[PDB]
């Protein structure tokens, strides 16, 4: 399945000592039915007012609550028993399924010598396990467990191992969690004055999240992975970790609409992030922000804590960006902030923006380019993964962003009722050009409008074959029907034979020298797979030269138009 | 009738005499998966199931209930994983006057290995097999036609719609597994194809000893940095790679390649082939490494 | 298809030395591969809370699937008896087809141990209280590794009958009334007595051009059961959905149009497909009042475009189809079947006889849900022009051909 | 003829990947067939260098004989 579904149900913090394994902090304390189908009060009030505590209130409702001592019809001691394996089953992938619940985690155990890393609770603890419970379907079990382990669990466990080796952070977090549990359950009169076990657990978790930093990391991780977002977690107030599961919303070939559901608004383009992420020139392309620039700055300020050179460079690049100009022109934005070192920094920043769902890669937008409405345009559906519709919502958003322009139905009908021409035929005047290009960037960034690229293949008729036969001889018959051509399509002109290369070089016979040069330089790309926009960018040619070569060679060139 | 079971017992039956009990009972230390009588002489051939060193055992059957042990004559050692079937390969004269037929054991195993085992005349004599005898009935004659080749046969106008050349890693990976137990042409071709992933093979035919490979070589007189697509067709003699029998190199007529450069490349290829066949070595990796690169 | 078993062993809880391996095929396979049973012996015989559950865990490069069973009865020593038929598989596979087999094997042996005390008496040792295991494990191992099936009798009335079935993806819920079904197989010869009567009614109407509403009206069937039957046929990978063919439709080439070129047998099938069997009468009608070559078919496939309806495309190129005797419906169907063209759906978003109350209600619900013209035309049983006229009477609307 | 074969008196090993469970031989000795869940592989025993002919039949269950 291409639809994103992070199948988390909760998180654990299972530590072990010489006295035996126990549990420290698990969240949420909800039941199986919901998940499957004094000064401390002032401090927690200030933390809730400032937004430092981000819990989910549906996890602590009366119908969505389970006891703190029970986790999915298992006791805390039971879970700490079967999630604390031996030394041979530690420091490796812990996969464990109980019917439909998979207990996936990477437990970290100290070695025999007593070091956490190869370069009270501070000395008794020999193992900790941040166990993640998933319930994927049996047809998607391997995919979900593999992506979760590769993208969240391994990174979080390795960072926790590093911070425990260098700082002994998890030991102190477990100590303060247990101290706050004792001080709420057995000392606080506010706990006894609160009615309902769910509200008691909500207040206890509020105190734990207020006093503990590892609890905040785990809570934010679960909340922002279950919501299919980027989870920025604060650990030890000195390092941050960003965790996500990547979303499949890019497709080159068109997916089957009514057999395999795909996110509405997916980018139906031949230029993809994943074609470039797997390679890790990209600087010949231009970026396209997925949100407002100030929102991207606010999201990227949570990617660090000290405002280092990388975040400053990335913020400067996001603030001064345009989707209509290539990334090779942005060397001046970082030359002032300090092949080439600036090109390497630009490439690394482009990978950072396009990997973390910030700035998608596009061909640089021009009014001369033909833009069609994508089949995957978010028109139907109440939300992105539904399966008032999204067209009216995005029309309201378009009216809010551009109040001096015609409505989103007018723009999406003007581009999909005639033959697909260049985008400059919608813009009335040159004064309307930047706001219309902003509207075009808004349409592309929402998956509404893709680009119609030109693909060229080479074709040879009977006259070229007869001329080549005459040239070969140099070194029926009673009638001449003109509607009985013997055509032939040379599929790959690079690996052509001697007679087929003669057919290609007899296709250009009487053309001038500039056409001969442009045909020779562009012969290897005439295979029906390379879009001519990339040929224009790479070969440093202009559009008038290409339209000259299309007009001068009409019956020999196959014209193929898709995204 | 002979039988074999999981307990390690090979039982020989004669149901004309008695349905209960067995004429002979041979006990092994391993379970037996496939046990069969020999097609020649008086004997039988059993192979293990999960243990027994994964070797096919050949046991004579020439004697008078007899609970005995396994005393094989020949053990076909090899086959790192278990054998799951064994076959026999028989050839003889077409007309038939004397019974002089040879046999070859073919075994297939779980480690994806298909091995052919020769049978010596020591095995042919240890088993009571009368090699050369007047036939009571003539042996059947079978057609020796292969079947690996692909077979083929309003109206339609005669047309060449798409170029065939615009439409082979399976071949170059299959030839790596061929071992005639560099000592082979196909092994050399597969090793070079694994060595050079950029070189594209268009026609590999070890049986007809003809090769046709395509590559991108830096042999452009206009610009030294430009790479020219080249088609080189190579024909090997039946005495390759002995001395005095070099491979024949033919380069397809290319418009991008000048005739002087083509003659220089052909002369250098002939020089390299003659110099490496003078030492009775193999000349296809130095030639390819000369055409593209150094 | 199905992963072979790596090691099968039968572990039982001895009352003296605890959990131990009784029999194991292949012999000493776990110790030869570095698998130590004492490392995970507390998962093979866990507490009775974890027992009678499908337990699968990873041990190195191997995946270990087991169904622990614990029977509580005063006949046994320590007031309980515990065993486990444990299966070992490699990690890099899918053990999903084998999990119901191991679960049912464990449940059947639970039934037999609760009934006649089979496994406890099979030890031939009177310390568990107050047919060969090894042969059964050998037969299960080799029958599931060689045939994916087994029939192994263990008693005078009991046998191990295991068949490994592949796992199929569930059908989607996106099938609707405007989708037409295409049967990829001859459904008349698959019909035996066990088919559903609804599906049996649907079969003589899946001709590749009938809508699900039209099939429901033709077969006197409720559309929901037709939707569920089409979903069940999708689940067996034999029916693919498509669109209603109209000349008001807009078709455009896809990214796989080069597969008409890079395929040795696609264009010949197009030639044998799109042509009328005789000189049809459509090839004699004017516009107003040998087989076709593969290059002609490719040039006709390219000439489709976005925003250009099939009426305009057909009236711009009608001498070509008349001279080459080409069925345009068959041409479009072959293009959609080879995924070389796609349909741009029409969306009537907002900013003649008197229409009925229920008709205007479902029209308003279709407009407020941004449904296509095809779904509204199917729901009202009306052509596109009547729906357009009613919508123009109701308000101003724009059409997106996405 | 069968007496000009290069592989009858010699020992030869071929690596045939794909997980083949069944095998059978011509009594003439020319071709050998291997069966798997994906189909049949026909190998020339006198020309083992040619890739085997793949006949397509996809089944989820393991072939027997």
Swiss-Prot record, chain A:
Compartments reported by the entry: Vacuole membrane
Extent of the signal sequence: 1-23
Pfam families, alphabetized: HTH_NPRL3, NPR3
Role of this protein: Component of the SEA complex which coats the vacuolar membrane and is involved in intracellular trafficking, autophagy, response to nitrogen starvation, and amino acid biogenesis. Mediates inactivation of the TORC1 complex in response to amino acid starvation. Required for meiotic nuclear division.
Subunit-level organization: Component of the SEA complex composed of at least IML1/SEA1, RTC1/SEA2, MTC5/SEA3, NPR2, NPR3, SEA4, SEC13 and SEH1. Forms a heterodimer with NPR2.
Family of this protein: Belongs to the NPR3 family.
Protein known as: Nitrogen permease regulator 3
Organism in which the protein naturally occurs: Saccharomyces cerevisiae (strain ATCC 204508 / S288c) (Baker's yeast)
Swiss-Prot record, chain B:
RWD domain mapped to chain residues: 187-294
UniProt WD repeat ranges: 78-127
Highest taxon of the lineage: Eukaryota
Compartments it resides in: Vacuole membrane
UniProt record similarity statement: Belongs to the WD repeat WDR59 family.
Note from the entry: Present with 556 molecules/cell in log phase SD medium.
Subunit text: Component of the SEA complex composed of at least IML1/SEA1, RTC1/SEA2, MTC5/SEA3, NPR2, NPR3, SEA4, SEC13 and SEH1.
Function: Component of the SEA complex which coats the vacuolar membrane and is involved in intracellular trafficking, autophagy, response to nitrogen starvation, and amino acid biogenesis. May be involved in telomere capping.
Name recorded for this polypeptide: Maintenance of telomere capping protein 5
Lineage: Eukaryota, Fungi, Dikarya, Ascomycota, Saccharomycotina
Positions spanned in the full protein: 217 to 539 of 1148
Curated annotation (Swiss-Prot), chain C:
A GO BP entry: proline transport
GO terms under cellular component: GATOR1 complex; Seh1-associated complex; vacuolar membrane
Compartments in which it is found: Vacuole membrane
Keywords on record: Membrane, Phosphoprotein, Protein transport, Transcription, Transcription regulation, Transport, Vacuole
Induction of the gene: By urea and proline.
Effect of gene knockout: TORC1 abnormally activated in presence of rapamycin.
Bilayer topology annotation: Peripheral membrane protein
Top-rank lineage group of the source organism: Eukaryota
Family: Belongs to the NPR2 family.
Note: Present with 319 molecules/cell in log phase SD medium.
PANTHER family on file: GATOR COMPLEX PROTEIN NPRL2, NITROGEN PERMEASE REGULATOR 2/TUMOR SUPPRESSOR CANDIDATE 4
Record function comment: Component of the SEA complex which coats the vacuolar membrane and is involved in intracellular trafficking, autophagy, response to nitrogen starvation, and amino acid biogenesis. Mediates inactivation of the TORC1 complex in response to amino acid starvation. Post-transcriptional regulator of nitrogen permeases. May be involved in putative NPR1-dependent phosphorylation of nitrogen permeases or in the processing and targeting of nitrogen permeases at the level of the endoplasmic reticulum.
Protein name from the UniProt record: Nitrogen permease regulator 2
Name of the coding gene: NPR2
